[PDB]
Design a protein around this ligand. Structure first.
Ligand SMILES: [K+]
Ligand SMILES: [Mg+2]
Ligand SMILES: [Mg+2]
Ligand SMILES: [Mg+2]
Ligand SMILES: [Mg+2]
Ligand SMILES: [Mg+2]
Ligand SMILES: [Mg+2]
Ligand SMILES: [Mg+2]
Ligand SMILES: [Mg+2]
Ligand SMILES: [Mg+2]
Ligand SMILES: [Mg+2]
Ligand SMILES: [Mg+2]
Ligand SMILES: [Mg+2]
Ligand SMILES: [Mg+2]
Ligand SMILES: [Mg+2]
Ligand SMILES: [Mg+2]
Ligand SMILES: [Mg+2]
Ligand SMILES: [Mg+2]
Ligand SMILES: [Mg+2]
Ligand SMILES: [Mg+2]
Ligand SMILES: [Mg+2]
Ligand SMILES: [Mg+2]
Ligand SMILES: [Mg+2]
Ligand SMILES: [Mg+2]
Ligand SMILES: [Mg+2]
Ligand SMILES: [Mg+2]
Ligand SMILES: [Mg+2]
Ligand SMILES: [Mg+2]
Ligand SMILES: [Mg+2]
Ligand SMILES: [Mg+2]
Ligand SMILES: [Mg+2]
Ligand SMILES: [Mg+2]
Ligand SMILES: [Mg+2]
Ligand SMILES: [Mg+2]
Ligand SMILES: [Mg+2]
Ligand SMILES: [Mg+2]
Ligand SMILES: [Mg+2]
Ligand SMILES: [Mg+2]
Ligand SMILES: [Mg+2]
Ligand SMILES: [Mg+2]
Ligand SMILES: [Mg+2]
Ligand SMILES: [Mg+2]
Ligand SMILES: [Mg+2]
Ligand SMILES: [Mg+2]
Ligand SMILES: [Mg+2]
Ligand SMILES: [Mg+2]
Ligand SMILES: [Mg+2]
Ligand SMILES: [Mg+2]
Ligand SMILES: [Mg+2]
Ligand SMILES: [Mg+2]
Ligand SMILES: [Mg+2]
Ligand SMILES: [Mg+2]
Ligand SMILES: [Mg+2]
Ligand SMILES: [Mg+2]
Ligand SMILES: [Mg+2]
Ligand SMILES: [Mg+2]
Ligand SMILES: [Mg+2]
Ligand SMILES: [Mg+2]
Ligand SMILES: [Mg+2]
Ligand SMILES: [Mg+2]
Ligand SMILES: [Mg+2]
Ligand SMILES: [Mg+2]
Ligand SMILES: [Mg+2]
Ligand SMILES: [Mg+2]
Ligand SMILES: [Mg+2]
Ligand SMILES: [Mg+2]
Ligand SMILES: [Mg+2]
Ligand SMILES: [Mg+2]
Ligand SMILES: [Mg+2]
Ligand SMILES: [Mg+2]
Ligand SMILES: [Mg+2]
Ligand SMILES: [Mg+2]
Ligand SMILES: [Mg+2]
Ligand SMILES: [Mg+2]
Ligand SMILES: [Mg+2]
Ligand SMILES: [Mg+2]
Ligand SMILES: [Mg+2]
Ligand SMILES: [Mg+2]
Ligand SMILES: [Mg+2]
Ligand SMILES: [Mg+2]
Ligand SMILES: [Mg+2]
Ligand SMILES: [Mg+2]
Ligand SMILES: [Mg+2]
Ligand SMILES: [Mg+2]
Ligand SMILES: [Mg+2]
Ligand SMILES: [Mg+2]
Ligand SMILES: [Mg+2]
Ligand SMILES: [Mg+2]
Ligand SMILES: [Mg+2]
Ligand SMILES: [Mg+2]
Ligand SMILES: [Mg+2]
Ligand SMILES: [Mg+2]
Ligand SMILES: [Mg+2]
Ligand SMILES: [Mg+2]
Ligand SMILES: [Mg+2]
Ligand SMILES: [Mg+2]
Ligand SMILES: [Mg+2]
Ligand SMILES: [Mg+2]
Ligand SMILES: [Mg+2]
Ligand SMILES: [Mg+2]
Ligand SMILES: [Mg+2]
Ligand SMILES: [Mg+2]
Ligand SMILES: [Mg+2]
Ligand SMILES: [Mg+2]
Ligand SMILES: [Mg+2]
Ligand SMILES: [Mg+2]
Ligand SMILES: [Mg+2]
Ligand SMILES: [Mg+2]
Ligand SMILES: [Mg+2]
Ligand SMILES: [Mg+2]
Ligand SMILES: [Mg+2]
Ligand SMILES: [Mg+2]
Ligand SMILES: [Mg+2]
Ligand SMILES: [Mg+2]
Ligand SMILES: [Mg+2]
Ligand SMILES: [Mg+2]
Ligand SMILES: [Mg+2]
Ligand SMILES: [Mg+2]
Ligand SMILES: [Mg+2]
Ligand SMILES: [Mg+2]
Ligand SMILES: [Mg+2]
Ligand SMILES: [Mg+2]
Ligand SMILES: [Mg+2]
Ligand SMILES: [Mg+2]
Ligand SMILES: [Mg+2]
Ligand SMILES: [Mg+2]
Ligand SMILES: [Mg+2]
Ligand SMILES: [Mg+2]
Ligand SMILES: [Mg+2]
Ligand SMILES: [Mg+2]
Ligand SMILES: [Mg+2]
Ligand SMILES: [Mg+2]
Ligand SMILES: [Mg+2]
Ligand SMILES: [Mg+2]
Ligand SMILES: [Mg+2]
Ligand SMILES: [Mg+2]
Ligand SMILES: [Mg+2]
Ligand SMILES: [Mg+2]
Ligand SMILES: [Mg+2]
Ligand SMILES: [Mg+2]
Ligand SMILES: [Mg+2]
Ligand SMILES: [Mg+2]
Ligand SMILES: [Mg+2]
Ligand SMILES: [Mg+2]
Ligand SMILES: [Mg+2]
Ligand SMILES: [Mg+2]
Ligand SMILES: [Mg+2]
Ligand SMILES: [Mg+2]
Ligand SMILES: [Mg+2]
Ligand SMILES: [Mg+2]
Ligand SMILES: [Mg+2]
Ligand SMILES: [Mg+2]
Ligand SMILES: [Mg+2]
Ligand SMILES: [Mg+2]
Ligand SMILES: [Mg+2]
Ligand SMILES: [Mg+2]
Ligand SMILES: [Mg+2]
Ligand SMILES: [Mg+2]
Ligand SMILES: [Mg+2]
Ligand SMILES: [Mg+2]
Ligand SMILES: [Mg+2]
Ligand SMILES: [Mg+2]
Ligand SMILES: [Mg+2]
Ligand SMILES: [Mg+2]
Ligand SMILES: [Mg+2]
Ligand SMILES: [Mg+2]
Ligand SMILES: [Mg+2]
Ligand SMILES: [Mg+2]
Ligand SMILES: [Mg+2]
Ligand SMILES: [Mg+2]
Ligand SMILES: [Mg+2]
Ligand SMILES: [Mg+2]
Ligand SMILES: [Mg+2]
Ligand SMILES: [Mg+2]
Ligand SMILES: [Mg+2]
Ligand SMILES: [Mg+2]
Ligand SMILES: [Mg+2]
Ligand SMILES: [Mg+2]
Ligand SMILES: [Mg+2]
Ligand SMILES: [Mg+2]
Ligand SMILES: [Mg+2]
Ligand SMILES: [Mg+2]
Ligand SMILES: [Mg+2]
Ligand SMILES: [Mg+2]
Ligand SMILES: [Mg+2]
Ligand SMILES: [Mg+2]
Ligand SMILES: [Mg+2]
Ligand SMILES: [Mg+2]
Ligand SMILES: [Mg+2]
Ligand SMILES: [Mg+2]
Ligand SMILES: [Mg+2]
Ligand SMILES: [Mg+2]
Ligand SMILES: [Mg+2]
Ligand SMILES: [Mg+2]
Ligand SMILES: [Mg+2]
Ligand SMILES: [Mg+2]
Ligand SMILES: [Mg+2]
Ligand SMILES: [Mg+2]
Ligand SMILES: [Mg+2]
Ligand SMILES: [Mg+2]
Ligand SMILES: [Mg+2]
Ligand SMILES: [Mg+2]
Ligand SMILES: [Mg+2]
Ligand SMILES: [Mg+2]
Ligand SMILES: [Mg+2]
Ligand SMILES: [Mg+2]
Ligand SMILES: [Mg+2]
Ligand SMILES: [Mg+2]
Ligand SMILES: [Mg+2]
Ligand SMILES: [Mg+2]
Ligand SMILES: [Mg+2]
Ligand SMILES: [Mg+2]
Ligand SMILES: [Mg+2]
Ligand SMILES: [Mg+2]
Ligand SMILES: [Mg+2]
Ligand SMILES: [Mg+2]
Ligand SMILES: [Mg+2]
Ligand SMILES: [Mg+2]
Ligand SMILES: [Mg+2]
Ligand SMILES: [Mg+2]
Ligand SMILES: [Mg+2]
Ligand SMILES: [Mg+2]
Ligand SMILES: [Mg+2]
Ligand SMILES: [Mg+2]
Ligand SMILES: [Mg+2]
Ligand SMILES: [Mg+2]
Ligand SMILES: [Mg+2]
Ligand SMILES: [Mg+2]
Ligand SMILES: [Mg+2]
Ligand SMILES: [Mg+2]
Ligand SMILES: [Mg+2]
Ligand SMILES: [Mg+2]
Ligand SMILES: [Mg+2]
Ligand SMILES: [Mg+2]
Ligand SMILES: [Mg+2]
Ligand SMILES: [Mg+2]
Ligand SMILES: [Mg+2]
Ligand SMILES: [Mg+2]
Lengths: 92, 77, 45, 60, 102
RNA sequence: UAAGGUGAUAUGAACCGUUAUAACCGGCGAUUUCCGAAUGGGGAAACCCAGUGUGUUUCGACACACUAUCAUUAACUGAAUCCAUAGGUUAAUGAGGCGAACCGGGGGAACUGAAACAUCUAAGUACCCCGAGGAAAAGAAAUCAACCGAGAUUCCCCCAGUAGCGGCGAGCGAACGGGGAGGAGCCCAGAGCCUGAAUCAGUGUGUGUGUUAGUGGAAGCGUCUGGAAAGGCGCGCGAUACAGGGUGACAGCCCCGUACACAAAAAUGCACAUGCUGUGAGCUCGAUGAGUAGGGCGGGACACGUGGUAUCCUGUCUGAAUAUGGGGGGACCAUCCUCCAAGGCUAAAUACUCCUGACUGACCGAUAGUGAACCAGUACCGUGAGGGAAAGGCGAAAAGAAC
RNA sequence: AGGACCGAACCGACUAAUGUCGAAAAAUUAGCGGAUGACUUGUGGCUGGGGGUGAAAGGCCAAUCAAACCGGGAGAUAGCU
RNA sequence: UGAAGGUGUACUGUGAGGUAUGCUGGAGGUAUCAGAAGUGCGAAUGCUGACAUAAGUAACGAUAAAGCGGGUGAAAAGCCCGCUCGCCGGAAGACCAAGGGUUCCUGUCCAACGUUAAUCGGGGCAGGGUGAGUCGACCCCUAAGGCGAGGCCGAAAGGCGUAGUCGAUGGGAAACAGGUUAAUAUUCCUGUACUUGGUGUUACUGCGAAGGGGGGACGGAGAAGGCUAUGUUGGCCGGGCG
RNA sequence: UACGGUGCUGAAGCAACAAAUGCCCUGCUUCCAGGAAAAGCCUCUAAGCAUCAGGUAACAUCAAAUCGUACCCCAAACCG
């Protein structure tokens, strides 16, 4: 089911207070995904790569901050984050 | 457009000279009419937008001879 | 007390947008000018 | 590696691509974000070694 | 076709530290050699918190131009300028006057 | 080719390499997201929505393919209707857009000048539109000369601010003949014998290349001043290399070059052999472009404003002879001379430079020179078309000032 | 029932003062007119320069109007300063 | 062993000027006689930059109003926390759309920005923050209107317009209460629901449009009844005895 | 109690009266100036198809993609 490509979706695990609080209390993982990356693709990726039972994936596109420094304006990339909820069988 | 199907007589421009030679721009339209010609070859009528002088070419030559020339250029009728 | 510019992004693109310029002979020439001068902002979009 | 990697089977040359994608690229890309990966050079050579295989399996 | 290179004894032709001899640490992309014990410049190194934090002045070996140095002969006992001959199938260097190979 | 590399602001981290799968520099491949002619449909450009077939699958599903429009060409298959055409499914092939000028054509001003202004001027100029090609257009006489003879077009210099034209004002302004650059001619409106032999238009074959990577490439030392020597001072030496640049001040000989001799695995642009799907030679007999030339009317182009106005083009209405003919020789006529319209294709001299090199300036040197030496068509201004800046230099070396 | 009456919202703009390098390139303060209609308003359309639109003032058409704005003819022309 | 340039001084020519040299400057300059000019500026309400003047003058943007204590800090009228006081309350409160686009929240930093100061900030510099089967958009459908195969028309450009296809400001399926974050919640969790499609087993069984009909589907004003949000007052419950 | 708040428990949790410009009411009366369109939806059959494919229930399962969501929004964040 969509082999090879699934590896390109998941970019990195997100590190924050909201990320950290949702590990223990809500039982989820927040992570940076590709710009494309549908909820099905992220679910299917986490299902294979991280090998855990996924409940549901909740996606949001973060906007790139405008960082003017020195003399030139310059804007960040519009990275997408996925709040992925896991089942009762979970891990780090 | 005001163009004879047969001869290619299109509308030219020119001046409208008055008694005091005041050149005001005008244009010379050709004597166009939508006429139906009986083609004896295929037993039918063919509508052609032609100038009065075109009709005389169609009468001088054959309608088939003119329709041969018309199709050579890539036209409809 | 109510000035001229009362913005609307639909009106922006409908009036002066890339496709709205692309639609017309004269609008293509505008873009051809901005390209010839070499502008970063070709149209508002 | 290109010279050795040229002379391989079409089905068998995919397995190296899938090995380059499964672990390596992904593993290093995830490990580098956390800040445990000291050796940063591995990200580059793997990306090129993919490209190599990708180019080499484009034989038709 | 670089005449001066890494493991090569050079002698300084011009500049303060004229006549001194040393080996090239690394020829730069800009066209400047860094010879050991030649242009000793006394830098004031500011103590950065991360990693080492010595906080003291240091004698750095500054760069000098490639043209300001020439390779040492170790036979005549003076500076000599470099050619490029084809001994065997290799573009090897040689000393102008006393035509030997390095 | 190569001993040092991982483009820059820009140090650092982690690593490649050092006689050859580092880097770099070329040839030919590969990948080439999305928008954009955009082309599956749409749309507020970089977004949203699809069908038919193919291969797979553990139910969920992906995957690659293909579908724009018109233009010709073919098959289809089909109305009102007999035949049929009109139409409609699929198929090849081509076109679509962009780009600085230059070219040909279709349209086409006004200010201004005339010391006002209407003819005239500005001027078929600006501008708009269409089609091009490396050039384009023009072109082998129905040319123009004067009883001498010349032999296609184009461009330069004369003829000449002449002859003319002109509210005979303002102004506009020829040709003949001459000197040059460059030279070249042919196909059709078709019938004998005889036929691949001149010719080209390809697949090509031959060297010579040229080009996009390159290699070698000469001979200086010592003192003096100074932060530093290339400088002065004194003696050398290479020169088919004293073009030029760099180097701590002004370098023939420190370095990169320069003159000179050599280079290409691969792609290509040339000029000659020449196997060739494919194309027609010599010579007979007879053809010679009709709604045409000319004319009336109205415009236009000719230097020539209808004037005594030849010439050409035509919107309009007409109308020959057709080679024992017709055009022209500047109203017109008659004699002479000269050409042969009513169909085509033709290189060179000519115009231009968005662009790629090299080289040169009695060109500029940061209020100059491009608007822009600098992250400039940027900031900023404007709904938008569009307008549009300012801002260069530490030092030989950051040794950029530890404390 | 009403282009009815009074009167908030809303729409207007009669008077006065303030302001006139303002708080504001047309406003503020106190009064003022209409306020179920020829009303008013949101969103999107359509009409283009000798052209539009105008319950008509030469009004309005992006703070510009007895002929907009931007680029071009263009260094128009100037017996004037 | 100190060029041009800058800045003084002393001579000198009838003038435009010229000569020499002190300091600064740190590398170019140029006799003579010829040649060519972007060849000399005080004015053009000149053009660009710099700097004066008025002048330490006006002003500091609603006359809704502050007062004191403590805190941190180099420093507090303005920041924080506390207690009073005042002002708005069909708003100067709370939610949206349009339009902005990170201004949100936390940590830090006051050079500039804030019409004063500033430890504070919509300021600078880091990090974090937007979680949808149900809300909205996209999507099915259309008005005004736009585009528009063929088509008719137009010197060229192109104009109009048919089948179609776009175009909401309109029509069409369904989720609430509570809890929760420094910053999001009709989205996360907790409870309890609902709608539309796809695909299987069972028991029945006559289904099917580019077509027909129904519905969607509609104006103003008025009047009256029945309700509800919401309020008030009792009761009830917990606290109060000033 | 880092002196911010977390953890735990938690009594009554009713009645009348009033009352909208809200809702029934896209209704009713009335008046004339006589008041969009088209799908979804419901229904009937043509061209078709007859142990088919379709409907219809019932239960099961599967799914509900993508984009916006912060914050200001009568304002110090929009137009000036
Ligand atoms: K009422
Ligand atoms: Mg969820
Ligand atoms: Mg979302
Ligand atoms: Mg970027
Ligand atoms: Mg004309
Ligand atoms: Mg008349
Ligand atoms: Mg005229
Ligand atoms: Mg007829
Ligand atoms: Mg007003
Ligand atoms: Mg404005
Ligand atoms: Mg508009
Ligand atoms: Mg419009
Ligand atoms: Mg670019
Ligand atoms: Mg390794
Ligand atoms: Mg080299
Ligand atoms: Mg060399
Ligand atoms: Mg490089
Ligand atoms: Mg770099
Ligand atoms: Mg560099
Ligand atoms: Mg670097
Ligand atoms: Mg390619
Ligand atoms: Mg595409
Ligand atoms: Mg296509
Ligand atoms: Mg498309
Ligand atoms: Mg569609
Ligand atoms: Mg399209
Ligand atoms: Mg847009
Ligand atoms: Mg797309
Ligand atoms: Mg697709
Ligand atoms: Mg097929
Ligand atoms: Mg997909
Ligand atoms: Mg197909
Ligand atoms: Mg096909
Ligand atoms: Mg096709
Ligand atoms: Mg077609
Ligand atoms: Mg055809
Ligand atoms: Mg048939
Ligand atoms: Mg039929
Ligand atoms: Mg029939
Ligand atoms: Mg037939
Ligand atoms: Mg036909
Ligand atoms: Mg046909
Ligand atoms: Mg083309
Ligand atoms: Mg030109
Ligand atoms: Mg032309
Ligand atoms: Mg005139
Ligand atoms: Mg005049
Ligand atoms: Mg005049
Ligand atoms: Mg006048
Ligand atoms: Mg003219
Ligand atoms: Mg003329
Ligand atoms: Mg073209
Ligand atoms: Mg050429
Ligand atoms: Mg050619
Ligand atoms: Mg030609
Ligand atoms: Mg021609
Ligand atoms: Mg001629
Ligand atoms: Mg001859
Ligand atoms: Mg003469
Ligand atoms: Mg007169
Ligand atoms: Mg003559
Ligand atoms: Mg003549
Ligand atoms: Mg001649
Ligand atoms: Mg020749
Ligand atoms: Mg020749
Ligand atoms: Mg060669
Ligand atoms: Mg050399
Ligand atoms: Mg020396
Ligand atoms: Mg000297
Ligand atoms: Mg000497
Ligand atoms: Mg040279
Ligand atoms: Mg030189
Ligand atoms: Mg030199
Ligand atoms: Mg130079
Ligand atoms: Mg110096
Ligand atoms: Mg010299
Ligand atoms: Mg010298
Ligand atoms: Mg010397
Ligand atoms: Mg070869
Ligand atoms: Mg060769
Ligand atoms: Mg070889
Ligand atoms: Mg090729
Ligand atoms: Mg002929
Ligand atoms: Mg004639
Ligand atoms: Mg006649
Ligand atoms: Mg005549
Ligand atoms: Mg007459
Ligand atoms: Mg005539
Ligand atoms: Mg002509
Ligand atoms: Mg004229
Ligand atoms: Mg006359
Ligand atoms: Mg004629
Ligand atoms: Mg006759
Ligand atoms: Mg006759
Ligand atoms: Mg003859
Ligand atoms: Mg004869
Ligand atoms: Mg005769
Ligand atoms: Mg004649
Ligand atoms: Mg005559
Ligand atoms: Mg002839
Ligand atoms: Mg003839
Ligand atoms: Mg001829
Ligand atoms: Mg003719
Ligand atoms: Mg040729
Ligand atoms: Mg020639
Ligand atoms: Mg060269
Ligand atoms: Mg010069
Ligand atoms: Mg200079
Ligand atoms: Mg400048
Ligand atoms: Mg300067
Ligand atoms: Mg330039
Ligand atoms: Mg830029
Ligand atoms: Mg603005
Ligand atoms: Mg702007
Ligand atoms: Mg310091
Ligand atoms: Mg009424
Ligand atoms: Mg009333
Ligand atoms: Mg009244
Ligand atoms: Mg009233
Ligand atoms: Mg009020
Ligand atoms: Mg007012
Ligand atoms: Mg007023
Ligand atoms: Mg008032
Ligand atoms: Mg009132
Ligand atoms: Mg009253
Ligand atoms: Mg009205
Ligand atoms: Mg109204
Ligand atoms: Mg308003
Ligand atoms: Mg209004
Ligand atoms: Mg419009
Ligand atoms: Mg128009
Ligand atoms: Mg006009
Ligand atoms: Mg009005
Ligand atoms: Mg008046
Ligand atoms: Mg303005
Ligand atoms: Mg006015
Ligand atoms: Mg006017
Ligand atoms: Mg002019
Ligand atoms: Mg002027
Ligand atoms: Mg001195
Ligand atoms: Mg001095
Ligand atoms: Mg001086
Ligand atoms: Mg003198
Ligand atoms: Mg002098
Ligand atoms: Mg002197
Ligand atoms: Mg001096
Ligand atoms: Mg110099
Ligand atoms: Mg000078
Ligand atoms: Mg001088
Ligand atoms: Mg001189
Ligand atoms: Mg001298
Ligand atoms: Mg002198
Ligand atoms: Mg002399
Ligand atoms: Mg001057
Ligand atoms: Mg001055
Ligand atoms: Mg003066
Ligand atoms: Mg300046
Ligand atoms: Mg004072
Ligand atoms: Mg005063
Ligand atoms: Mg005073
Ligand atoms: Mg005072
Ligand atoms: Mg005061
Ligand atoms: Mg204030
Ligand atoms: Mg005031
Ligand atoms: Mg107030
Ligand atoms: Mg009060
Ligand atoms: Mg304290
Ligand atoms: Mg603090
Ligand atoms: Mg303290
Ligand atoms: Mg402190
Ligand atoms: Mg203290
Ligand atoms: Mg203290
Ligand atoms: Mg206080
Ligand atoms: Mg206060
Ligand atoms: Mg709030
Ligand atoms: Mg928005
Ligand atoms: Mg903004
Ligand atoms: Mg910011
Ligand atoms: Mg904040
Ligand atoms: Mg702080
Ligand atoms: Mg602190
Ligand atoms: Mg301060
Ligand atoms: Mg700082
Ligand atoms: Mg301050
Ligand atoms: Mg704070
Ligand atoms: Mg901030
Ligand atoms: Mg679900
Ligand atoms: Mg919906
Ligand atoms: Mg249309
Ligand atoms: Mg069409
Ligand atoms: Mg069109
Ligand atoms: Mg057309
Ligand atoms: Mg639609
Ligand atoms: Mg809507
Ligand atoms: Mg329901
Ligand atoms: Mg609670
Ligand atoms: Mg909280
Ligand atoms: Mg709620
Ligand atoms: Mg609600
Ligand atoms: Mg339950
Ligand atoms: Mg549930
Ligand atoms: Mg249910
Ligand atoms: Mg369902
Ligand atoms: Mg349909
Ligand atoms: Mg339908
Ligand atoms: Mg309605
Ligand atoms: Mg009714
Ligand atoms: Mg009603
Ligand atoms: Mg009631
Ligand atoms: Mg009740
Ligand atoms: Mg109630
Ligand atoms: Mg209640
Ligand atoms: Mg109440
Ligand atoms: Mg009461
Ligand atoms: Mg009681
Ligand atoms: Mg009570
Ligand atoms: Mg009681
Ligand atoms: Mg009790
Ligand atoms: Mg009690
Ligand atoms: Mg108690
Ligand atoms: Mg009641
Ligand atoms: Mg009401
Ligand atoms: Mg009411
Ligand atoms: Mg009601
Ligand atoms: Mg209603
Ligand atoms: Mg429904
Ligand atoms: Mg239903
Ligand atoms: Mg059911
Ligand atoms: Mg989906
Ligand atoms: Mg919110
Ligand atoms: Mg909030
Ligand atoms: Mg607020
Ligand atoms: Mg508010
Ligand atoms: Mg309000
Ligand atoms: Mg409001
Ligand atoms: Mg305000
Ligand atoms: Mg306010
Ligand atoms: Mg503002």
């Amino acid at each position: 089911i969509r082999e090879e490509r699934l590896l390109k979706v998941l970019r990195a695990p997100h590190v924050s207070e909201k990320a950290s609080t949702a590990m223990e209390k809500s039982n989820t993982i927040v992570l940076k995904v590709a710009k494309d990356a549908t909820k099905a693709e992220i679910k299917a990726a986490v299902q294979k790569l991280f090998e855990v039972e996924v409940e549901v994936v909740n996606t949001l596109v973060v906007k790139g901050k405008v960082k003017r420094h020195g003399q030139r304006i310059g804007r960040r990339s519009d990275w997408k984050k996925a709040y992925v909820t896991l089942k009762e069988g979970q891990n780090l | 457009s005001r163009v004879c199907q047969v001869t290619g007589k299109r509308p030219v421009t020119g001046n409208n000279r008055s008694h005091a030679l005041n050149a005001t721009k005008r244009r010379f339209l050709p004597n166009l009419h939508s006429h139906r010609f009986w083609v004896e070859s295929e037993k039918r009528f063919v509508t052609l937008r032609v100038s009065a002088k075109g009709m005389r070419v169609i009468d001088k030559k054959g309608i088939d001879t003119v329709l041969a020339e018309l199709r050579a250029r890539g036209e409809k009728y | 007390m109510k000035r001229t510019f009362q913005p609307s992004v639909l009106k922006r693109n409908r009036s002066h947008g890339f496709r709205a310029r692309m639609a017309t002979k004269n609008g293509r020439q505008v873009l051809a000018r901005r390209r010839a001068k070499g502008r970063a902002r070709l149209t508002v979009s | 590696m290109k010279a050795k990697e040229l002379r391989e089977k079409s089905v068998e040359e995919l397995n190296t691509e899938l090995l380059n994608l499964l672990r390596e690229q992904f593993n290093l890309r995830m490990q580098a974000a956390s800040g445990q990966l000291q050796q940063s050079h591995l990200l580059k050579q793997v990306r090129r070694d993919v490209a190599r295989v990708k180019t080499l399996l484009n034989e038709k | 076709a670089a005449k001066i290179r890494r493991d090569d004894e050079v002698i300084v032709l011009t500049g303060k530290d004229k006549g001194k001899r040393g080996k090239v640490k690394n020829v730069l992309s800009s066209g400047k050699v860094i010879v050991e014990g030649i242009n000793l410049v006394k830098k004031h190194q500011k103590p950065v918190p991360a990693l080492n934090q010595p906080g003291g002045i240091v004698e750095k070996e500054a760069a000098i131009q490639v043209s300001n140095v020439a390779i040492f002969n170790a036979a005549t006992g003076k500076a000599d300028r470099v050619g490029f001959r084809f001994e065997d199938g290799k573009k090897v260097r040689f000393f102008k006057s006393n035509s030997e190979t390095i």
